[PDB]
């Protein structure tokens, strides 16, 4: 096809294996914020990986915003090290990539009406709710947001292979509805 | 002699009492919840109709 | 009936008083009737 | 109200002491200093000592100083 | 002009704004919650759980746990079985 | 201007503490002495558990310890952030810039992270 | 037992030092000093809320931020406090906010 | 000391007026209720002081 989706955001969860004090982490951390009224976790941000992590009192943490798997893992390790430097016995247990988001452009307008007519079983096009057509691929469990401008956003992937496979599957279908 | 008018007037008075009754109930539920209520949604047209 | 009684019934219907604090008052003033429509 | 929740707080402090594990009985005035009960009137403390401390089953009195009964709960 | 199309009702958006601004009640520390509960019992001998939740400003489940620890439910002729803030 | 506001604050403070000085039974000369002194004073890692593989992943924490630089203390009404920038509706408050004090009612701020 | 914001400023520091001097002289009891501080906090909050009717603006960059118990602890660098009447330049600033 | 005691007695004189003004109405009870309300605010207001000292 000659086009490869590029990752825009990766979500990864990792267990630190130890209970934590959210108030203490908020008071001692650098970029952390804690609003129990708003959210039950502590939201921290690190600029060099350019990512945001939510840390819960249960010891489990979620890292988002990483553009690469290596970046996500490194950012999770950095957050764990910050919590550890705050004196807690933080560890790096069962780190996993829960979801990946990728974006790309097909470089041609698309007839979402024809696409939904052909693939009604997987397509959902509601201009009232959202201008982008939602396609639910089955063989990869990937959700694709296709837009008339040609931009395609894939989500729900656990590995980059799923993103690339989903785009490879969808591209021939889209090429048949080129405007 | 009760012609169409007075008879329809009796029925309409009964149905309007009803309409205000459901209006009161619907508005009271929202007021108890503390949220304002939509007057148009409070009205049941099927009552009179 | 249409000209007098409906409007008079609506007028005579007591204003709706609600309170449970803010209190709301609903008053029905005027009757309008359009031509039969489908 | 007045002079009830303070007594409840003292009794709760006794449970906290027992989660600490200090079997040695403590003086009521020292307990008040730890619980910030200095502001309360002395007469209420005296009424507590004479009546409520003895009525409370968990509380015990040893050598003129009040503390829980280590026998009551299972060991 | 009746029932004009609208994305969301004005009362609904106002109520949602109020809820978002207020935010969910937070789970405070046991010591502070206990002190507030004891202060409330001083004002009133008998409290209903619904009003006690408003007074304490704590999650219902957390408040129920702390209240089960010390206070006890009495079945009464006031109208129904209600909590008793006296530990004994 | 700011000194005049300070004098008005002095008047408000003394008026507000008179009742407490009567409640505690202390003589009123304490307030005069307090005002005098106050004015004088003013004017492949398979085994990933070890986190030591990375170092110097932080910054100097002494800024918050020092606090010697300029400090602004106020109240916030709305604070919004959209993925890069922090926006500030800080309401009435006080600012300590280069020793000289500043007073404001509405403060609007935009910053980048 | 109040907001307790302006204590860590020039005004609060001067008041605290004066109270310390009187305490050293035994002229005032520490409870009286604490009461004076509380009353000062109330009065200063009211005074800033009421007698201040001027708007200010500022821009810059943010290097750190913290939030806990409804307390923001922003840390900005190279801030420019712009006002219609005057402009002030500062290399670094710490903004503590509460509500 | 005797003068101080006489000054103190005037306190009890005016606490008599307090009872009367209470009977005119309960003033003491109202004051106690007001005192009860502050405790919670003080605890919340206090919480900030300990953490702010740690922060700065």
From Swiss-Prot, chain A:
It is found in: Nucleus. GO terms for biological process: DNA-templated transcription initiation; mRNA transcription by RNA polymerase II; positive regulation of transcription initiation by RNA polymerase II; RNA polymerase II preinitiation complex assembly; spermatogenesis; transcription by RNA polymerase II; transcription by RNA polymerase III; transcription initiation at RNA polymerase II promoter. The keyword Nucleus applies. Belongs to the TBP family. Widely expressed, with levels highest in the testis and ovary. The TFIID basal transcription factor complex plays a major role in the initiation of RNA polymerase II (Pol II)-dependent transcription. TFIID recognizes and binds promoters with or without a TATA box via its subunit TBP, a TATA-box-binding protein, and promotes assembly of the pre-initiation complex (PIC). The TFIID complex consists of TBP and TBP-associated factors (TAFs), including TAF1, TAF2, TAF3, TAF4, TAF5, TAF6, TAF7, TAF8, TAF9, TAF10, TAF11, TAF12 and TAF13. The TFIID complex structure can be divided into 3 modules TFIID-A, TFIID-B, and TFIID-C. This is TATA-box-binding protein. DNA binds at residues 9, 45, 60, 99, 136. Transmembrane segments: none annotated. It comes from the Eukaryota. GO terms for cellular component: chromatin; cytosol; euchromatin; female germ cell nucleus; female pronucleus; male germ cell nucleus; male pronucleus; nucleoplasm. Signal peptide: none annotated. Sequence repeats lie at residues 7-83, 97-174. The keyword Transcription regulation applies.
Swiss-Prot record, chain E:
Keywords: Acetylation, DNA-binding, Nucleus, Phosphoprotein, Transcription, Transcription regulation. Its main location: nucleus. It comes from the Eukaryota. One of its GO terms (molecular function) is DNA binding. It is found in: Nucleus. GO terms for cellular component: microtubule cytoskeleton; nucleoplasm; nucleus; transcription factor TFIIF complex. Transmembrane segments: none annotated. DNA binds at residues 77, 79. One of its GO terms (biological process) is positive regulation of transcription by RNA polymerase II. Belongs to the TFIIF beta subunit family. Heterodimer of an alpha and a beta subunit. Interacts with HTATSF1 and GPBP1. Interacts with URI1. Interacts with GTF2B (via N-terminus); this interaction is inhibited in presence of GTF2F1. TFIIF is a general transcription initiation factor that binds to RNA polymerase II and helps to recruit it to the initiation complex in collaboration with TFIIB. This is General transcription factor IIF subunit 2. It comes from Homo sapiens. The lineage of its organism: Eukaryota, Metazoa, Chordata, Craniata, Vertebrata. The gene is GTF2F2. The chain holds residues 151 to 238 of 249 of the full protein.
UniProtKB/Swiss-Prot annotation, chain F:
DNA binds at residues 80-81. InterPro entries: TFIIA_asu/bsu (IPR004855), TFIIA_b-brl (IPR009088). TFIIA is a component of the transcription machinery of RNA polymerase II and plays an important role in transcriptional activation. TFIIA in a complex with TBP mediates transcriptional activity. It comes from Homo sapiens. SMART domains: TFIIA. The lineage of its organism: Eukaryota, Metazoa, Chordata, Craniata, Vertebrata. This is Transcription initiation factor IIA subunit 1. The keyword Metal-binding does not apply. One of its GO terms (biological process) is transcription by RNA polymerase II. Belongs to the TFIIA subunit 1 family.
From Swiss-Prot, chain H:
It is found in: Nucleus. Component of the TFIID basal transcription factor complex, composed of TATA-box-binding protein TBP, and a number of TBP-associated factors (TAFs), including TAF1, TAF2, TAF3, TAF4, TAF5, TAF6, TAF7, TAF8, TAF9, TAF10, TAF11, TAF12 and TAF13. Component of the TFTC-HAT complex, at least composed of TAF5L, TAF6L, TADA3L, SUPT3H, TAF2, TAF4, TAF5, GCN5L2/GCN5, TAF10, TAF12 and TRRAP. (Microbial infection) Interacts with SV40 Large T antigen. It is linked to Intellectual developmental disorder, autosomal dominant 73: An autosomal dominant disorder characterized by intellectual disability ranging from mild to severe, developmental delay, speech delay, behavioral abnormalities, and non-specific dysmorphic facial features. The gene is TAF4. The chain holds residues 942 to 1011 of 1085 of the full protein. Transmembrane segments: none annotated. The TFIID basal transcription factor complex plays a major role in the initiation of RNA polymerase II (Pol II)-dependent transcription. TFIID recognizes and binds promoters with or without a TATA box via its subunit TBP, a TATA-box-binding protein, and promotes assembly of the pre-initiation complex (PIC). The TFIID complex consists of TBP and TBP-associated factors (TAFs), including TAF1, TAF2, TAF3, TAF4, TAF5, TAF6, TAF7, TAF8, TAF9, TAF10, TAF11, TAF12 and TAF13. Belongs to the TAF4 family.
């Amino acid at each position: 096809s000659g086009i490869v989706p590029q990752l825009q955001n990766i979500v990864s969860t990792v267990n630190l294996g130890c209970k934590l004090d959210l108030k203490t982490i908020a008071l001692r951390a650098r970029n952390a914020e804690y609003n129990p009224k708003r959210f039950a976790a502590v939201i921290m941000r690190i600029r060099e990986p350019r990512t945001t992590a939510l840390i819960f009192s249960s010891g489990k943490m979620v890292c988002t915003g990483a553009k690469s798997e290596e970046q996500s893992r490194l950012a999770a390790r950095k957050y764990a090290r910050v919590v550890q430097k705050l004196g807690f016995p933080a560890k790096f247990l069962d780190f996993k990539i829960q979801n990946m988001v990728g974006s790309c452009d097909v470089k041609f307008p698309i007839r979402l009406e024809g696409l939904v007519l052909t693939h009604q079983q997987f397509s959902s096009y509601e201009p009232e709710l959202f201008p982008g057509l939602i396609y639910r691929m089955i063989k990869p469990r990937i959700v694709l947001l296709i837009f008339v401008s040609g931009k395609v956003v894939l989500t729900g992937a656990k590995v980059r292979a799923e993103i690339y496979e989903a785009f490879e599957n969808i591209y021939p279908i889209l090429k048949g509805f080129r405007k | 002699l009760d012609l169409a008018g007075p008879l329809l007037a009796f029925l309409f008075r009964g149905m309007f009492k009803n309409l205000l009754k459901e209006v009161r109930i619907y508005a009271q539920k929202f007021i108890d919840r503390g949220k304002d209520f939509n007057l148009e949604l409070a009205i049941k047209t099927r009552i009179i109709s | 009936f249409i000209q007098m009684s409906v409007q008079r019934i609506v007028e005579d219907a007591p204003p709706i008083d609600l309170q449970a604090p803010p209190r709301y008052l609903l008053k029905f003033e005027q009757i309008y009737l359009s031509k039969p429509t489908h | 109200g007045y002079k009830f929740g303070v007594l409840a707080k003292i009794v709760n402090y006794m449970k906290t002491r027992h989660q600490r594990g200090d079997t040695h009985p403590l003086t009521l005035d020292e307990i008040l200093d730890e619980t910030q009960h200095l502001d309360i009137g002395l007469k209420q403390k005296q009424w507590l000592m004479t009546e409520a401390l003895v009525n409370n089953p968990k509380i015990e009195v040893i050598d003129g100083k009040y503390a829980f009964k280590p026998k009551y709960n299972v060991r | 002009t009746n029932y004009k199309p609208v994305a969301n009702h004005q009362y609904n958006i106002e109520y949602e704004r109020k809820k978002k601004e207020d935010g969910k009640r937070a789970r405070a520390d046991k010591q502070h919650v206990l002190d507030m509960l004891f202060s409330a019992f001083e004002k009133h001998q008998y409290y209903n759980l619904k009003d006690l939740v408003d007074i304490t400003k704590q999650p219902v489940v957390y408040l129920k746990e702390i209240l089960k620890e010390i206070g006890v439910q009495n079945v009464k002729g006031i109208h129904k079985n209600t909590w008793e803030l006296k530990p004994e | 201007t700011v000194p005049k506001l300070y004098r008005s604050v002095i008047e408000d403070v003394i008026n507000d503490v008179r009742d407490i000085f009567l409640d505690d039974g202390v003589d009123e000369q304490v307030l005069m002495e307090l005002k005098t002194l106050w004015e004088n004073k003013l004017m492949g890692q398979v085994e990933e558990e070890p986190l030591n593989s990375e170092d110097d992943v932080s910054d100097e924490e002494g800024q918050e310890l020092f606090d010697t630089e300029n400090v602004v203390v106020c109240q916030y009404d709305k604070i919004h952030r959209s993925k890069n920038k922090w926006k500030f509706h800080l309401k009435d408050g006080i600012m300590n810039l280069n020793g000289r004090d500043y007073i404001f009612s509405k403060a609007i701020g935009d910053a980048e992270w | 037992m109040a907001y307790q914001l302006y204590r860590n400023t020039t005004l609060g520091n001067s008041l605290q030092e004066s109270l310390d001097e009187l305490i050293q002289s035994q002229q005032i009891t520490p409870q009286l000093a604490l009461q004076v501080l509380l009353q000062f906090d109330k009065a200063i909050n009211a005074a800033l809320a009421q007698r201040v009717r001027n708007r200010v603006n500022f821009r810059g960059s943010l290097n750190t931020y913290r939030f806990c118990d409804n307390v923001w602890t922003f840390v900005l660098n190279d801030v420019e406090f712009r006002e219609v009447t005057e402009l002030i330049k500062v290399d670094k600033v710490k903004i503590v906010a509460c509500d | 000391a005797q003068l101080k005691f006489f000054e103190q007695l005037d306190q009890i004189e005016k606490q008599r007026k307090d009872e009367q003004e209470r009977e005119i109405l309960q003033l003491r009870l109202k004051q106690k209720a007001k005192e009860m309300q502050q405790q919670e605010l003080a605890q919340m207001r206090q919480r900030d002081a300990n953490l702010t000292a740690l922060a700065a």
